[PDB]
Symmetry: D2
Subunit: 498 residues, 4 copies
């Protein structure tokens, strides 16, 4: 039982040596320099996130270039993620550029674009034409990231609602609008996003963090916008509102991965329901074996302070215990005073949660919900992890070209490193969002075809020795194909390190 | 499995209507008026904490009187908790009220009272006379809830240490000092603590939150200080340092309950380990059925903001999921701008986490760890909870005079309210730290002896009806003694509301 | 796990003192005398079975009278069961009273009653008019308790099948016929059965063992034949063929109990499938809490030998481990040389299987399959049994007039005696087919109404002391109603024996 | 749960097509001809047992030769088991060949050979010279598989005891004597046993069934008697008395397997305890993965009848459900009228019980009891079985030379056949006592070394196809070493049948 496991925990015991969870950092003026990025990497950043809400292509090019230089200097494979702006709903402009509201104020909000630039206390524009279908009398409209709240009192015509203002607030031009609990018929990709994705495909980004994903169809439209050139780039769908949460099954099926985008999600649904959504989404991703990232405000106060709050420490530990592959930092590294320290704390907190995790409970829980019969690669991979628990293996080793087999092994949550020997650099970079995985690159152009796996396996066992994952006489669990089977691994071996 | 429970969670289901978990609020300037307290109570405060780190007896008397007046106006039983100063270590004053420190700043710290009021960038006072025995050269002194370090360069003399400042801090009056990994030899009950405890007995406080408890011995010292007239007052031991966590088992056995005092704890041990201690301590308390409070920085940002961070919501929810009876607010209500709102958020987060909790997992885990044979009253109480699950009872009803039986039912974590009819007002107030329990006072001196229990059961069933727990025809599980057993409950009944 | 429980079993430990399972004995020339029956009773017979296949009413009257005299002498309550002949299918007569068949012999079997008395090698009668609808070409007809086998080769006309003889056998007049796997449209009650049931109702039998029950409707026709005078007599349906097994759910719902009539069942379905049927039927009865009897050849060789075969010992142990309330003896006591010894062995074997049973596994398994919400009497009863495991109670005590509450408690398979204080003698007799139950009679006509239960409870606790179930200072779990609830028990108490 | 598994059982589903459990048959007059043995093999015999209690070397030579000739004709590998006389105690002869005893009959028993041939109602011979040291006055002497008792009245002299006959028996030549609770001091290897064991080594028998094993020491004495040339012969220890059961753990550790010898056991300890010993012993063997045979009176009545009793069918089925690898026939095939039919029933009952077995319950129970870390080959074998469940494999295929790896896979109780390709004919024969294993011989001397395993795997896959275990496109789980590991299997593969 979780309870019996808890009572036997010890704060004094040494912790795990090898961090399993992974850390995504948002780059910004605190962290964009090659020097900054090197330290971020030494501190534990696995994936660098470019937030295309802010900054020009020129700005993000510097990030891309600096990340590549920083990683090349340290001999690391660091993923690069493009996080789209996404479509949005905004108010119009106001006269004199602002208006102040008070509780009780009645205000008409209109979908008539005539009113776009002449917002007053009495009447202002919202640029979502379907508005008077999507929110009914009694429903709420949230303005400015939830900070001001309107109750719809009535529909005046097919383009205008009379609303009641709930709280004091000062609006400036073009504030964000959220419609909590309303379906929202905005396109998966805005015009700006197309140019942003085109840029990402051209610069060879490893993954898109796709904003405001509400339906599987929208994931497909993002895949389509990436076209043939970008067919290999991961799509990590950001779950940001109620529809996202409702359609999670079919969104998970269409995506390569998920981000629990708690910031927007906590505006769209009550803040307290975000923990329910988080637990549900992470677990559902664990069940199908797709990477999931927990995001937003995890270590917020470290934007300004050199130590985190108690709440913050528990937030990170709990996202790890919930089952998340990755945890993420935004402002904390984009613009905070302590980018290095914050990543270091997050690394330490991860390691503690990892050591306090019951080894085999995830493995069993996950395995028990799989449909039987399994595909044989998945039987090979789960049973490899089982056999890793049985011999207390110190590492596993898998040959994966696309990353599929590595993600399949990580799905079953071994308690040791998963060394992945791959033939694609992009795969080394993409496996950064997968718990436990450590990539080594095998250069076929330079060392040859390796039909019988022996060179890739040697390379992996040498890496295991060098990185101090295991030593001479330790058992490693090795997964690849036999001499004739092609396209997936059908073989597991137990090998003593020579 | 936890995983299978998670994938079935929904954000679209209604939540529980009756909050099981309980909220402790610290009273200060924001919240001391009769009016402010009434609103805290309405917002969901169950226990008012007096922090005797600060304030005179007279100040706390005003708190005690105003709590009683507010509780009487609303007809509530609200516990009053005295939280001791304990073996605290603080700085003196500074000229002007701050000084500011740069890294590499070399500073003299002195135990010499002479410098108490007159501290500067160069020399200042610390109120622990044995300082230069406690920490030697190369040791570290933590300052102001851990936000600034000093390394000790040398012992100047028996009164003065020369110290290297390690980082960047602006330092206000009388701030907290911690000395992790140092033999600090201060009493659990200082002379000042002894007066405060006597004042609490005199004033009839319901519970002591005993600071820095390190040993079962220290708990007993707090018991002795309370004397004869004070023997029914709960002692809740605050676990705040390394040694508290080491000795947790015998500390629990001596105490009436525990507070995981995450503030000092997260300075005294590495901050990332607090999450492991929390889990471990809460579960150990759940196992012996003793109340446990999770404290400190839970909704910290709401000290200044109208909304909590995503980390803070999850921190609260996870304290509840961990098994904590109570969650605590400190600065958030003592001195924040939004005391009522912060209590309201906490109450809503509690209810969400309570609704995401698997019905019976706690029941079974707790039961499976109990030594067999049980005492009869424990067999009756655990079986009563089982039968509540089986009939889907909307409430339970227990007669308890000392509170023991109410705590015993609560130990088995039913999913419905536990209505406790008690013959002591103090029991009503002390049961505010126990998950699920709602108290009704039966005045035996005024209404008679009730040997056959029909008066008290009627009172509790009518309360069930009035407070909208159950209605006519609903089953209620009713626990007390039969007509001849005295001293504990030997009987369970299932009863339909008339 | 069953496996871990097994490896820790010990043959050397003392066994349970109080036999939980119950023994049904068939009376016959070995055992009909008052003296014989007294010894049978001392040996462990709980229910005496009269097989109305053989003997006249006069014969069975002697059994009834002798059983009553024998029981009255020993002060026991012994159930009396009437086991119907049931409808049957038979061949006609043969010329010269017999015919011999050989493998390969072709024989017409006809439904034309003209051929009733003139059976030959070539052609003989079977008295089931629907025969040529019920068994198709390729199907089998079993003759003489399965000993000879015919394959239907073809239908000649609507009353005649050509059949192939499978094995050597000699037929005499009017042998039994079975149609394996065929629906069989015979009435629930034959004419002879009506007169037999009428007799049973008049003589006050406690239960019918109803033969050849195929459908719930047939159980209802047996209840109807018992009329108003016999509305209180248990109907234990004998499951004897494939239809019985197929319709078991709805047959269990209609009956008071089940007999796995392995003898006929092993003729109708392959002998090896009888173990599957047995395990399934017993478990299904356990799940709904209805008594189930395992029957036939359990200790067969003891008909002639003074010790049982190894197979036989395991058969009895395994019926107990499967979950059967009762095991039964036929020939072994009706006509065998060692009626006393055989019942003694069966008692000893039961006790060993009981002691080797894992206490709480049945309890948990049974409780886990109940629909929630439960009726409150069933919550009271399961939780009483739970609380009996928790305090290691040595007995339970329940007030039951119809026997319902006692059967409800036994359903949850406590490891101790269940003392039932009843106001009906017939209930004492009927509870003999219920595991663990020991009945005491409370005479209301002579000691008064006992509205507050105290006299019945005293009587029960006195019985517990006298029979050496428990002594002074032991906990007994007591189940009845409180002072106002009528018709079921809503209360459980734990009481120390004074 | 077992209960929930049972209620889902059906008698209408098809049964397993490949029998997992294995049948040992004792050879005698009924069954010694080459023809009779061919039919036993066709009917399902896997191991022929020679009972050296009776018969000369020459008689057993005929058995050995005829088994080989019959097995060769059919192309089967059939094990040959030598079952020792051991420390047996028998009566002498009687004039005429019976005498008959009445209760109260006072009789002299004598160790004096003089009376060997000439026994009467009054005096007869017992071949244990230390008799009058072993049992003293008031002790009991059991005679002829326990069917008749004598109490010892006095020691006449060192050669003669006066005995009270307790019951009614007709006594044939050279019948078995048991002395429960007596210090009987006879060697595990008599002079006669030593010759028999040497003859078995000379003749190349596959296994010894060692009678009356009492200690691990005795097992080692049987090992030493087998000498150098005999070291690969299995020793299966027969547990037959009180002390065997006491010492079961260290007896198992010394042996290659165990027989629960229920015949002598059920006389040496009370007969009702045998069912507890059986369960306990079989499970302990399953836990260390050593073969266990359940023996004696399993289908006893079929010695004379064409059909078994209901008890005997359930006895067989429950031996299988208990975990037994093998079930044994004694008199049923040595001397019965229906040897072929009795083997056929047993085979059908085995398959039913196998089909009623829960797939994975045994796998998990066995796995959960193994010390971690496992040796690599055990992690490979248990994980191979797990992956068989997960892909619903129709067969497994393992390379085994000694049989160790085949027994290791079998220990984890897969639900499909385990095809074992072995390089030793003796391994083929010895694996007949292991559940599920089907052997194929690869003649390395004739077909070459097969370092890369492709020859043996091809041989086993073609066997899978020929024997109708799997077909083209079916997955098979294949266990052996990779290209460089020697001594055990370190590799698992999933392979589709070509
Ligand atoms: O790229 P993924 O889909 O992970 O497949 C990798 C697996 O396929 C195989 C076989 O095709 O690759 P490889 O041909 O590179 O040797 C296995 O060896 C390897 O483990
Ligand atoms: O006859 P059953 O159906 O078992 O009902 C018995 C239960 O009902 C009650 C209440 O009606 O009977 P009683 O009136 O005889 O006291 C309970 O005390 C008793 O346990
Ligand atoms: K963005
Ligand atoms: K304090
Ligand atoms: K009958
Ligand atoms: K023998
Ligand atoms: Mg957004
Ligand atoms: Mg503190
Ligand atoms: Mg019949
Ligand atoms: Mg024997």
């Amino acid at each position: 039982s979780q309870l019996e496991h808890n009572i036997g925990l010890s704060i004094f015991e040494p912790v795990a040596k090898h961090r399993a969870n992974r850390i995504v950092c948002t780059i910004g003026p605190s962290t964009q320099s090659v020097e900054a990025l090197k330290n971020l990497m030494k501190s534990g950043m696995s994936v660098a996130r470019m937030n295309f809400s802010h900054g020009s292509h020129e700005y993000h090019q510097t990030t891309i270039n600096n990340v590549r230089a920083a990683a090349a200097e340290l001999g690391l494979h660091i993923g690069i993620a493009l996080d789209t702006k996404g479509p949005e709903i905004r108010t119009g402009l106001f006269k004199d550029g602002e208006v102040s509201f008070a509780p009780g104020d009645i205000v008409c909000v209109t979908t008539d674009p005539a009113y776009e630039k002449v917002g007053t206390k009495e009447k202002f524009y919202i640029d979502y034409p379907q508005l008077t279908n999507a929110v009914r009398p009694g429903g709420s409209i949230y303005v400015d990231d939830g900070v001001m709240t309107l109750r719809v009192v009535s529909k005046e015509d097919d383009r205008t609602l009379k609303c009641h203002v709930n709280n004091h607030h000062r609006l400036t031009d073009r504030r964000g609008i959220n419609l909590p609990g309303c379906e929202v018929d905005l396109p998966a990709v805005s015009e700006k996003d197309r140019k942003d994705l085109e840029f990402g495909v051209a610069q060879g980004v490893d993954m898109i963090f796709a904003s405001f994903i509400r339906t599987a169809e929208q994931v497909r439209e993002v895949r389509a916008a990436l076209g043939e050139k970008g067919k290999d780039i991961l799509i990590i769908s950001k779950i940001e509102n109620h529809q996202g949460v409702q359609n999670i099954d079919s969104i998970i099926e269409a995506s390569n991965g998920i981000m629990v985008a708690r910031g927007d999600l906590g505006v769209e649904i009550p803040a307290e329901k975000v923990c329910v959504a988080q637990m549900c989404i992470i677990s559902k991703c664990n069940v199908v074996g797709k990477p999931v990232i927990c995001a937003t405000q995890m270590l917020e106060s470290m934007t300004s302070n050199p130590r985190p709050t108690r709440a913050e420490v528990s937030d990170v530990a709990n996202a790890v215990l919930n089952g998340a592959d990755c945890v993420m930092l935004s402002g904390e590294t984009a613009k905070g005073k302590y980018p290095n320290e914050v990543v270091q704390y997050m690394a330490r907190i991860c390691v503690e949660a990892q050591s306090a995790t019951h080894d085999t409970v995830m493995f069993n829980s996950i395995k028990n919900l799989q449909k039987i019969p399994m595909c044989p690669e998945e039987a090979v991979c789960s049973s490899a992890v089982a056999s890793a628990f049985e011999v207390q293996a110190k590492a596993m080793l898998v040959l994966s070209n696309t990353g599929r087999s590595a993600r399949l092994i990580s799905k079953y949550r071994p308690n040791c490193p998963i060394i992945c020997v791959t033939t694609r650099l992009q795969t080394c970079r993409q496996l950064n969002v997968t718990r436990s995985v450590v990539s080594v690159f095998y250069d076929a152009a330079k060392s040859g075809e390796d039909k019988d796996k022996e060179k890739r396996v040697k390379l992996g066992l040498d890496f295991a020795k060098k990185e101090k994952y295991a030593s001479t006489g330790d058992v490693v669990v090795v997964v690849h194909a036999d001499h004739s089977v092609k396209g997936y691994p059908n073989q597991t071996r137990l090998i003593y390190l020579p």
